[PDB]
């Protein structure tokens, strides 16, 4: 295979698709993520996008994911948050509906993900100090 091109899905192409199908197009969204009145407005918008990106990277850095898109955690998933089958959410539900369905608990979820990793971090520490 030498005379073929490379074509991927466009920006937000899998917005209405399933979770399993939209999980393979996160790279394009991640890459697209990044007279003086006009200059001040443009620089303010660019800088605002910069703190939003750094805030997202900082929120991911406090967890056990140092930059990877897909990553697993050690905290258990509370069944009381959704009480639904994994097969039907990953095969018959988009990301928009899933986002508005659990829009409340995400914040407190982030908090456990954070402290948990904190104690988890010192876990390897009191083991790595045994060397």
């Amino acid at each position: 295979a030498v005379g073929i091109g490379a074509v991927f899905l466009g920006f937000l192409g899998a917005a209405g698709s399933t979770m399993g199908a939209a999980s393979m197009t996160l790279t394009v969204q991640a890459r697209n993520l990044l007279l003086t009145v006009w200059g001040i407005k443009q620089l303010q918008a660019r800088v605002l996008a910069v703190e939003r990106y750094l805030r997202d990277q900082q929120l991911l850095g406090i967890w056990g994911c140092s930059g990877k898109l897909i990553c697993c955690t050690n905290v258990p998933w509370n069944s009381s948050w959704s009480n639904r089958n994994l097969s039907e959410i990953w095969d018959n539900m988009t990301w928009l509906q899933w986002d508005k369905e659990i829009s409340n608990y995400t914040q407190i979820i982030y908090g456990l993900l954070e402290e948990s990793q904190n104690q988890q971090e010192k876990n390897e520490q009191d083991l790595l100090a045994l060397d």
């Binding site: 991911l60 897909i70 990301w95 928009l96």
Partner: protein, 445 residues
């Protein structure tokens, strides 16, 4: 249960938020639009199926930002031009008699005055032609400009032109522009065919108050949009699926003469006219306007009662910019009388008309009495060929039992003109944070 939460980055989540858009142009350049980065060739259009977005106009910030950007660009464009402060002087003015007609009698005035020159030690007596709406009587009587008691203003430089070149609005990093591809998209509702785009299409920022000139056409039929159709105080936007041609002209062979008023700077006064002088006017085809009005009545019969008598009437009153259809034609501002276009009633069941237009030199068009702008004269006759694709109606409520419904042209605000074209676009904010359950755990090293 053997389930564990997992975080995902770059997930397609849309939130509604405020965002300052970026200017773009096709790109010698004029109208000072070079301050923004030019548009990128072949903009990407990505269709988004299996998703419905609840589009809602009259609350979108894109039209507000466009209005602010147009005001800022106009203010920055008028900055290098020279101010017209020495014009506020006593003007020994009189009427015109050379080949004047009956309808144009008293409209134009020949005013003579003393003005400074490049030498501050001496003055010079000059003369110029001013319209009746441009001068007011102080008491061969003395006259003065209409903007003398108000703040003075600059004039349009002869190098810059008023051509409404199309501009594009591109979203910054982390935001997206959604466009509704529905052929019969309503004012507010869930659009079935949504598609994201990097930059908006070519939007011409024209200036109009009653008839939408050079606007975007519809898809298959004329559309009626309104925030509250039952409210008489809300403007009714009408979009045409076919364009109604209009031919506006000024047969006056005006001559522009430059007189020195200071060091280097000069003022472009109206010299002697050439030949016969006639009133400027606009011609509209009777058949096309009649069938367009019939289509409009047919669409209004779907919202209200179809067995209700409908009638069109002219403007009630107020400012000249609201009552008369104000626009621009080759650098000359026109104020046409739309009484001949809204003088018909419709019951439940080759030839063209002319409209006289007045010409002013002091134009604000933004209700900003804080300042103005002097339109310099244009050499030769003025000719403009265009086509209206919309209307801004207003319901004259007060009746009962759904009877004698009347419509009058209005919409003095400048946001309706841009709302009729920026209704398809919407700004959304991308949220890359996502969570989902998966049967996996992080291995301990």
């Amino acid at each position: 249960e053997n389930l564990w939460v997992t975080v995902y980055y770059g997930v397609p989540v849309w939130k509604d938020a405020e965002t300052t858009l970026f200017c773009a142009s096709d790109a010698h350049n004029v109208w000072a639009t070079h301050a923004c980065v030019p548009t990128d060739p072949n903009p990407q259009e990505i269709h988004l199926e299996n998703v419905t977005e609840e589009f809602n106009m009259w609350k979108n910030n894109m039209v507000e930002q466009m209005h602010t950007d147009i005001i800022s660009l106009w203010d920055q464009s008028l900055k290098p031009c020279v101010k017209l402060t020495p014009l506020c002087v006593t003007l020994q003015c009189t009427n015109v008699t050379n080949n004047i007609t009956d309808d144009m009698r008293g409209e134009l005035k020949n005013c003579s005055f003393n003005m400074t020159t490049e030498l501050r030690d001496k003055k010079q007596k000059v003369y110029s032609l001013f319209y009746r709406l441009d001068v007011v009587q102080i008491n061969n009587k003395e006259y003065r400009l209409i903007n003398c008691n108000t703040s003075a203003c600059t004039q349009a430089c002869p190098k810059v032109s008023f051509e409404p070149i199309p501009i594009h609005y591109c979203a910054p990093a982390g935001f997206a522009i959604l466009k509704c591809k529905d052929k019969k998209f309503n004012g507010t509702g869930p659009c079935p065919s949504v598609s994201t785009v990097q930059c908006t299409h070519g939007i011409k920022p024209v200036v109009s108050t009653q008839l939408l000139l050079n606007g975007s056409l519809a898809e298959e039929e004329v559309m009626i949009r309104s925030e509250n159709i039952t409210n008489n105080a809300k403007n009714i936007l009408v979009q045409f699926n076919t364009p109604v041609q209009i031919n506006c002209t000024r047969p006056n062979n005006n001559t522009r003469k430059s007189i020195r008023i200071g060091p280097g700077q000069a003022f472009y006064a109206t010299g002697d006219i050439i030949g016969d002088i006639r009133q400027a006017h606009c011609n509209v085809s009777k058949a096309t306007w009649n069938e367009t009005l019939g289509k409009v009545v047919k669409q209004l019969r779907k919202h209200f009662g179809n067995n209700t008598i409908i009638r069109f009437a002219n403007s009630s009153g107020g400012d000249l910019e609201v009552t008369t259809h104000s626009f621009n034609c080759g650098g000359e501002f026109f104020y046409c009388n739309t009484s001949g276009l809204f003088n018909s009633t419709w019951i439940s069941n080759n030839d063209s008309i002319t409209l006289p237009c007045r010409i002013k030199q002091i134009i604000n068009m933004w209700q900003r009495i804080g300042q103005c702008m002097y339109a310099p004269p244009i050499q030769g006759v003025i000719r403009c060929v265009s086509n209206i694709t919309g209307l801004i109606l207003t319901r004259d409520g007060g009746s009962t039992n759904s009877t004698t419904e009347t419509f009058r042209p209005g919409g003095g605000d400048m946001r309706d003109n841009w709302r009729s074209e920026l209704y398809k676009y919407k700004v959304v904010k991308i949220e890359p944070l996502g969570v989902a359950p998966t049967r996996c755990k992080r291995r301990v090293v």
